[PDB]
A paper describes a structure:
Both clustered and non-clustered Pcdhs control these phenotypes through homophilic interactions of their extracellular cadherin (EC) repeat domains. Using sequence co-evolution analysis, we predicted intersubunit EC1-EC4 interactions, and proposed that clustered Pcdhs form extended antiparallel homodimers engaging EC1-4.
We determined the crystal structure of PcdhγB3 EC1-4, the first full antiparallel dimer for a γ isoform. Based on multi-angle light scattering (MALS), peak 1 was wide and polydisperse (~200–300 kDa). Peak 2 was monodisperse at 80 kDa – consistent with a dimer – and readily yielded a crystal structure. As expected, each EC forms a seven-stranded Greek key β-sandwich motif, similarly to other clustered Pcdh structures. Notably, EC4 has a unique β-strand arrangement compared to EC1-EC3 and all known cadherin repeat structures. Third, the PcdhγB3 EC1/EC4 interface is much larger (BSA = 976 Å2 per protomer) than the EC2/EC3 interface (555 Å2 per protomer). In the PcdhγB3 EC1/EC4 interface, F86, one of the predicted affinity-driving residues from EC1, wedges into a cavity created by hydrophobic EC4 residues. A PcdhγB3 EC1-4 F86A mutant indeed disrupted dimerization, resulting in a monomeric protein as measured by MALS. Together, these results indicate that the EC1/EC4 interaction is not strictly required for the specificity of dimerization but it drives dimerization affinity through non-specific hydrophobic interactions.
Numbering used by the authors:
A (entry chain A), B (entry chain A): 1 to 414
């Protein structure tokens, strides 16, 4: 008048809630004349009209009735007749730990960049529990891992929530994935728990610059190398992923004489020629090469292209004389013509042998390495032979050898 | 025998190179009988056959003749007749500073990320100079800038090259571009210089996490809110650029009861409803909201959606009686029926006025706020009126008010 009992949830049917008749001043001597009965649209309790006992009639699930409410009370009216009267009854439904905690998904992915500093904190999804009180108060535990630990905090209402903490730096180059296990154990009786797996995927950062396989790429190519030919191929390695690893090669500090001669592929890094090499013009090229990635990390190496000499220049003859005139009475040994040979090549390709083709009354006398004198060696008479067509030949010592001829007409005078 | 002169380049035509006749033992008394002349395919010098002077015949450009060679020598043969003889002459061509330095392009762009540490070094393109010696030895100067300075180094051959150095950190959020000026001055006489402009473009880094405009978005909506209605809109601001600024919003630590009720757009961040709100079930929702960017920076806020009560539940009447029986000789005031009203709403929407419709020999007597007793108030006789159809009405105090009726038949007994 009124009265309030208190029973745990999930009791079997027919469990004694109370002695409503005894507790409300009734006597068994008038248990039937009064005809007590319960009145409620929910068939949760029934009054035994023989002895007056309030009993459980159906399943009383506190989670379905009150949910997350801190208190669970069921209010109804027991009505009696002769005389008619209402008797308000309230029954408190205590919570039992009959529900385990749960996570939203069994496996959760978490993207964390390798630039995360030691001590960085990342939010973790908390567990849910339809119970109340200590039966839903959770305790979180992370399985031991060399890189990640767990800190546990509490909200302003006392409920716990976990956070992942980084205690050792990450390196996608070393380990791109970490598999963690999280467990939630409630504080009810008995203890109930659940587990979820966290796949930490290490997001790539551009912490690795390109690295050339060599700080110097040296090669020797002949000067008669056709245009478009491959000469060498540089190579840079980037340990990072995606755009952080795409490398673009380019020449640096290059001149127009080399810009019109060589080409470096931006992607493949293969060096080729686009013009004609000439040993007589330049015998070596030192070129700086730069490699860049997506994050603008740079690396620098050098390329030395040495050019070897080829015998692609024929010897040259230059002649002089006294207006191509010779007096017929000239003494033996008189200078008649001057010979000057020259070859643009080097080594034995540039060495010159100069000789006289024919059977003339003349003779070549060598003065220096590249200077000769055509001198008279025989008789002369304008009446018999008025002029001589003297042919001088020059041949280098290359492989294959090259040669050239030059013929001068020498007139005989009286 | 031989002889080697030395003249600067770019001399006017007719400039005296030397006195070849005097220097080679010749005398003017036989200047004509000898007929000295120069022999070379390049028309660079001519011998005056009157006095024997070697003179400049055409333009002698050392850059076109020898290029970048440290020394420039022109070797030719002066030939004399009567008697015929060769005379080797070498002429050293000195270099003058008649060429300015040059850069490949007037404006150069350079991408540098704002993560560049103080002291970082970046390669700069060196200037080119077709001169040699000190006339091509360059000196680089950077115009004063608060963020960038310049260091000057030298290769193993003594040639200088510049490098840009960062002395103050970069912040694309503060200044995305820096305009620098580079000048190269050679060491010749007179000094020649050239300028190039360097547009440093600051590459964006994800150094700015998202920032919510509010740490709490509170709003009050009625329970009869139709599904699909907009309730609020969160907002996060990211100062960075591109993917580093694209923000994705999502709920965190959400349950299935709320997952089936609310929806948060990943792009617009607009919160809407997808189910039906019921004040009788839950009057408030506190939801955690997460905002992420491309670099996985995170921000967290909260959203509180309060639900206000609406009068959408009609009052309910529950009746009891002694098998719907009344004895005709019952005394005035006898309990005949029990009335139990209840309303699920709150406030005045839940307050109940219970009244009797009709002119019966009965009367409602209130016992508690929600319990009444139908009591006899008049005469009774089964021979005259054997039964009464008593209609009880209940009306709440909401706006608009709701009501309900329930009619019970009470039989009159002898
Ligand atoms: Ca339960
Ligand atoms: Ca429970
Ligand atoms: Ca539990
Ligand atoms: Ca790394
Ligand atoms: Ca990396
Ligand atoms: Ca990289
Ligand atoms: Ca050649
Ligand atoms: Ca050659
Ligand atoms: Ca040759
Ligand atoms: Ca010049
Ligand atoms: Ca010059
Ligand atoms: Ca110069
Ligand atoms: Ca910044
Ligand atoms: Ca930024
Ligand atoms: Ca950002
Ligand atoms: Ca409602
Ligand atoms: Ca309502
Ligand atoms: Ca109502
Ligand atoms: Cl009583
Ligand atoms: Cl070059
Ligand atoms: Cl002589
Ligand atoms: Cl929730
Ligand atoms: Na003769
Ligand atoms: Na009567």
């Amino acid at each position: 008048e009124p009265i309030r009992y208190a029973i745990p949830e999930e009791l079997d049917r027919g469990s004694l809630v109370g002695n409503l008749a005894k507790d409300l001043g009734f006597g068994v001597g008038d248990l039937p004349t009064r005809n007590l009965r319960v009145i409620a649209e929910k068939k949760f309790f029934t009054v035994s009209p023989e002895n007056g006992n309030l009993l459980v009639s159906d399943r009383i699930d506190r989670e379905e009735i009150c949910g997350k409410k801190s208190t669970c009370v069921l209010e109804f009216e027991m009505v009696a007749e002769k005389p008619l009267n209402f008797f308000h009854v309230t029954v408190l439904i205590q919570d039992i730990n009959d529900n385990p905690p749960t996570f939203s998904q069994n496996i959760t992915e978490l993207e964390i960049s390798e630039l995360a500093l030691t001590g960085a904190t990342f939010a973790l999804e908390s567990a849910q529990d339809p119970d109340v009180g200590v039966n839903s108060l959770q305790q979180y535990y992370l399985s031991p891992d060399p890189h990640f630990s767990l800190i546990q905090k509490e909200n302003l209402d006392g409920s716990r929530y976990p956070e992942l903490v980084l205690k050792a730096p990450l390196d996608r180059e070393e380990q791109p994935h970490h598999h963690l296990v999280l467990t939630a154990v409630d504080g009810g009786e008995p203890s109930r728990s659940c587990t979820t797996q966290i796949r930490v995927i290490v997001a790539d950062a551009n912490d690795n610059p390109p690295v050339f396989t060599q700080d110097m790429y040296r090669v020797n190519v002949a000067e008669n190398l056709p245009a478009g030919s491959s000469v060498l191929k540089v190579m840079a390695i980037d340990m990072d992923e995606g755009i952080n690893a795409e490398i673009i090669y380019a020449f640096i500090n290059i001149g127009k004489e080399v810009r019109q001669l060589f080409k470096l592929d931006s992607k493949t890094g293969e060096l080729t020629t686009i013009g004609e090499l000439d040993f007589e013009e330049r015998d070596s090229y030192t070129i700086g090469v730069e490699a860049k990635d997506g994050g603008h990390h740079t690396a620098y190496c050098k390329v030395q292209i040495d050019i070897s000499d080829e015998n692609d220049n024929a010897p040259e003859i230059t002649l002089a004389s006294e207006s191509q005139h010779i007096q017929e009475d000239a003494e033996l040994g008189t200078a008649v013509a001057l010979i000057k040979t020259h070859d643009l090549d080097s080594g034995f390709n540039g060495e010159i042998l100069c000789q006289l083709k024919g059977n003339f009354p003349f003779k070549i006398v060598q003065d220096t390495k590249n200077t000769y004198r055509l001198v008279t060696d025989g008789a002369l008479d304008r009446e018999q032979i008025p002029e001589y067509n003297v042919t001088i030949t020059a041949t280098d010592k290359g492989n294959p050898p090259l040669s050239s001829s030059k013929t001068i007409t020498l007139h005989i005078l009286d």
